[PDB]
């Protein structure tokens, strides 16, 4: 099973979230280029164990608390352990996710294995993947998560 | 005008019909209140510590010049308060059970 | 007002002849959703959700007014804690008594 | 005049008074405009792992 | 608030203290001298004037 | 009220131009693109106790440093008597409300780049006419000057008169029981900021005493066993909340007034101040008083860097020249702990522990700053943090003299 888990709709490895506007081919389940900002890479920050956020006054934009218990600037690269997401999806959906859609930040979701699901589309007509993800986020809670689309 | 909160000053210094004795009382009462003042920013740490770090919290607050949060009490006050509890109970020790 | 002598017909006819549409129905659209969700509005200091900008504007115009509002004495003084919001499920808890 | 030094004395310091001996009727003082905040907060729970 | 001092025992208090006695004859006593009062000061001033 | 001031711009550290960029000019915490009355806008609303800093503002002092450098390029009217422009940006109006791109109607002359230019308000007559609205410029310019004169840490002034604290001040002081030093500094900045004030004022004298009291507590000379006038500053354990020192009033013993009037200039001699809030707060608070009252006397040039030698209205070596002392926080903490055990607040075992804790805490400050410096080399174009050398963390300076002054000051 550990060698053929894909046949049971189970995938391994982490999940990335980067705004990509492609015109040609796309293959999320079999990437060709090396993934960016592997954990421990330069300027890569891992969220704190509470996933809390702090506001700032008069123009200064909020900051996120890393594992070092230090507020950090949201823009850049970030790593989310799944559990932190499960307890802080709301603040993520309210502050981090918009920055992702702006392409000003990249997020790596750490989760060893997970159930995935697919959705096919016609490559000819226009499409935007954001609503599907936004729905998927809306159904995460401290208890469990829906399969990755 | 000093420390103008946009339109209005935070405190003023004026001279008017006023007897010293009453003024002396009023000033001390202010001193008493300010002695009870607590810095609000420390609340979040108080919460986090009291929660044994099981909770992490944020409480934003604006910092104006004149701001009063009479919530602090020294250990002496509490210790005295505890002793007072024993005294008021002394006639009927059974009254402590509801605790 | 100011006079608005209409222009010559021929010029108007020529101008009206050349008027391409502004928006067309093209399947290919490279559509892009809004960056910020327009369906809900949150109070940036207490994170209360709202359905419209007007409702949110009033809430901060009431609940988050740091005015030195009254030169007359305030009728009431509130307790330290008014409310808390649990992030993990978006439930707001009200102090059993803030007044 | 003894009860009105703060009004008719050219050598009157601000806020001074001989309280233990007699009572003056006209004096200088501070009037305050304190503010009484209320707190609304957000609390986050620690992750499982 | 303060009734026990009047209702029971001698009201002529000096400085409150609580203690417990161990069988070994050792006595552990904890005094509770009050912190700096403010009303008391101005009251004494009022009496003086 | 005071109607004239003097000042001096920053010094380029070998670089050819003032060390800031347009984005800095675009991201000030106050009103859009105005440097005045903005040195606290980044923390007007606060939560928690964590210091506030960011990638391009990585130290608590960083924002003020940038503001100081920014002002250095646009204060020509107080030197050349005329408004100028730099890189196509100038003031909106002669009142200097804020900065804006130059209009294409009557472009002002381009500013000639220079450093350490002396300043005199009398070079710009319109300031006197519009004093009621240009008042905050006085405070900020003075603050910039007080930092520019030092290569290592802001300079500020202390004094204590022979008379006891006047009653009027005591009435004002009690409003500030139980408030931390940082908040007080913010209040002090606002006071001298908005409207012109007479040098003689209950509020002015009040803040002056506050500055003296805090220093007395800083050395540990003032504590709950020996108050100034019932007042003193409380301290938390350095291992946690090392900066939440607050003001307290107490009914205990009072220190007797000094034999003669005491006054001196003070400075931090180690880079620690750049990321330690209390140094900034204390310096700004004292500087605020000097801003409204002017400088009591010229400063001694002897211990100052080269560019500060002999500034016209600032430094001198004559007779009426107040000396300037400097100190290092770590030995200062050691002295403060020693006072506490001598006064009997603590046992020697605790005193040993406190020194270990503080030294460990200070080490992190050094480690943070030194790593941050290489991340922001001064040759990049902007100076978020002031350059230093590793040996600067070990200098003891005149710390021994400093505590001696406090002992002579409160007695």
UniProtKB/Swiss-Prot annotation, chain D:
Subcellular location: Virion
Domain of life: Viruses
Disulfide-bonded cysteines: none
Assembly description: Homodecamer; each decamer is made up of two conformers of VP2, called VP2A and VP2B. 12 homodecamers assemble to form an icosahedral capsid. Interacts with VP6.
Its biological purpose: Inner capsid protein that self-assembles to form an icosahedral capsid with a T=2 symmetry, which consists of 120 copies of VP2, with channels at each of its five-fold vertices. This capsid constitutes the innermost concentric layer of the viral mature particle.
Family recorded in the similarity comment: Belongs to the turreted BTV-fold inner capsid family.
Protein name, UniProt field: Inner capsid protein VP3
Lineage, highest ranks first: Viruses, Riboviria, Orthornavirae, Duplornaviricota, Resentoviricetes
Gene name of the encoded protein: S3
Shown stretch of the complete protein: 1166 to 1214 of 1214
Curated annotation (Swiss-Prot), chain F:
One Pfam family of this chain: Sigma_1_2
Primary localisation category: virion
Annotated compartments: Virion
Gene3D superfamilies reported in the protein's UniProt record: 1.10.287.1520
Disulfide bonds: none
Keywords: Capsid protein, Intermediate capsid protein, Virion
GO cellular component: viral intermediate capsid
Membership in a protein family: Belongs to the reoviridae clamp protein family.
Oligomeric and partner information: Interacts with capsid proteins VP3, VP5 and VP7.
Role summary: Located at the interface of the incomplete T=13 outer capsid and the pseudo T=2 inner capsid, 120 VP6 subunits clamp and stabilizes the inner capsid shell.
Name of protein: Clamp protein VP6
């Amino acid at each position: 099973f550990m060698a053929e888990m894909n046949l049971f709709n189970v995938a391994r490895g982490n999940l990335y979230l980067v705004q990509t506007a492609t015109n040609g081919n796309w293959s999320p389940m079999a990437p060709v280029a090396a993934p960016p900002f592997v954990r421990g890479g330069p300027n890569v920050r891992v969220v704190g164990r509470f996933g809390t956020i702090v506001p700032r006054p008069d123009g200064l934009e909020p900051q996120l608390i890393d594992d070092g218990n230090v507020p950090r600037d949201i823009a850049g690269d970030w790593v989310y352990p799944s559990d932190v997401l499960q307890v802080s999806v709301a603040v993520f959906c309210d502050y981090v996710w918009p920055m992702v859609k702006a392409g000003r930040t990249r997020v790596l979701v750490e989760l060893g294995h997970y159930v995935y699901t697919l959705h096919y589309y016609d490559p000819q007509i226009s499409l935007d993947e954001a609503p599907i993800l936004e729905e998927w986020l809306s159904k995460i809670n401290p208890a469990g998560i829906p399969p990755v689309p | 005008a000093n420390l103008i909160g946009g339109e209005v000053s935070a405190m003023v210094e004026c001279m008017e019909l006023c007897d010293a004795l009453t003024l002396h009382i009023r000033e001390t009462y202010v001193m008493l209140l300010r002695s009870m003042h607590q810095d609000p920013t420390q609340i979040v740490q108080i919460v986090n510590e009291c929660a044994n770090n099981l909770l992490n919290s944020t409480i934003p607050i604006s910092l104006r010049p004149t701001i009063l949060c009479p919530w602090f009490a020294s250990s002496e006050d509490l210790r005295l308060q505890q002793v007072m509890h024993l005294v008021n109970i002394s006639s009927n020790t059974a009254a402590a059970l509801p605790l | 007002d100011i006079i608005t002598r209409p222009t010559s017909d021929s010029i108007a006819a020529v101008a009206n002849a050349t008027k391409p549409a502004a928006v067309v129905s093209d399947p290919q659209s490279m559509k892009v959703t809004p960056i910020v969700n327009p369906s809900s509005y949150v109070c940036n200091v207490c994170n209360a959700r709202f359905s419209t900008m007007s409702a949110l504007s009033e809430h901060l115009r009431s609940d988050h007014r740091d005015d030195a509002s009254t030169l007359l004495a305030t009728p009431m003084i509130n307790n330290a804690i008014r409310s808390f919001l649990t992030a993990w499920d978006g439930i707001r808890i009200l102090s059993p008594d803030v007044s | 005049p003894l009860r009105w030094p703060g009004l008719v004395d050219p050598n009157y310091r601000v806020g001074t008074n001989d309280l233990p001996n007699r009572i003056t009727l006209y004096n200088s003082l501070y009037r305050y405009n304190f503010t009484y905040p209320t707190l609304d907060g957000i609390m986050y729970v620690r992750s499982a792992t | 608030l303060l009734d026990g001092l009047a209702l029971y025992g001698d009201p002529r208090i000096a400085d409150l203290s609580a203690a417990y006695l161990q069988y070994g004859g050792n006595v552990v006593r904890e005094h509770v001298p009050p912190g700096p009062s403010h009303i008391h000061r101005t009251l004494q001033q009022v009496e003086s004037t | 009220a005071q109607r004239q001031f003097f000042g001096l711009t920053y010094n380029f550290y070998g670089q050819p131009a003032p060390l800031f960029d347009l984005n800095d000019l675009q991201e000030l915490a106050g009103c859009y693109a105005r440097p005045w009355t903005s040195r606290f806008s980044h923390l007007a609303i606060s939560t928690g106790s964590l210091p506030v800093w960011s990638a391009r503002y990585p130290s608590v002092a960083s924002r003020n440093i940038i503001v100081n450098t920014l002002l250095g390029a646009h204060l020509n009217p107080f030197a050349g008597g005329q408004v100028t422009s730099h890189q196509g940006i100038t003031w909106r109006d002669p009142v200097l409300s804020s900065l804006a791109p130059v209009p294409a109607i009557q472009p002002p002359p381009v500013w000639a780049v220079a450093e350490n230019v002396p300043l005199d308000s009398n070079n710009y007559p319109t300031y006197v006419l519009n004093l009621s609205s240009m008042w905050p410029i006085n405070q900020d310019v003075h603050i910039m000057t007080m930092w520019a004169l030092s290569d290592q840490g802001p300079i500020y002034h202390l004094e204590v008169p022979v008379d006891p604290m006047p009653a009027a001040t005591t009435a004002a002081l009690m409003a500030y029981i139980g408030v931390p030093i940082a908040h007080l500094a913010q209040t002090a900045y606002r006071f001298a900021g908005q409207l012109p004030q007479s040098p003689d004022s209950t509020m002015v004298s009040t803040i002056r005493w506050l500055s003296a009291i805090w220093f007395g507590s800083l050395t540990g000379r003032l504590n709950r066993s020996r108050t100034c006038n019932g007042f003193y500053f409380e301290f938390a354990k350095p291992a946690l909340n090392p900066d939440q020192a607050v003001l307290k009033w107490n009914d205990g013993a009072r220190a007797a007034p000094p034999a003669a009037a005491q006054s001196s200039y003070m400075r931090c001699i180690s880079p620690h101040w750049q990321h330690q809030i209390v140094e900034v707060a204390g310096a700004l608070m004292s500087q605020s008083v000097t801003a409204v009252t002017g400088l009591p006397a010229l400063i001694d040039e002897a211990t100052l860097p080269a560019w500060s030698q002999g500034v016209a209205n600032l430094t001198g070596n004559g007779q009426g020249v107040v000396p300037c002392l400097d100190y290092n926080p770590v030995p200062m903490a050691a002295a403060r702990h020693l006072q506490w055990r001598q006064d009997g607040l603590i046992t020697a075992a605790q005193e040993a522990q406190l020194n270990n804790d503080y030294t460990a805490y200070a080490l992190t400050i050094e480690r943070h700053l030194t790593a941050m410096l290489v991340a922001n080399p001064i040759a990049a174009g902007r100076m978020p943090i002031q350059p230093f050398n590793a040996a600067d963390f070990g200098q003891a300076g005149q710390t021994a003299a400093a505590v001696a002054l406090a002992q002579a000051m409160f007695v």
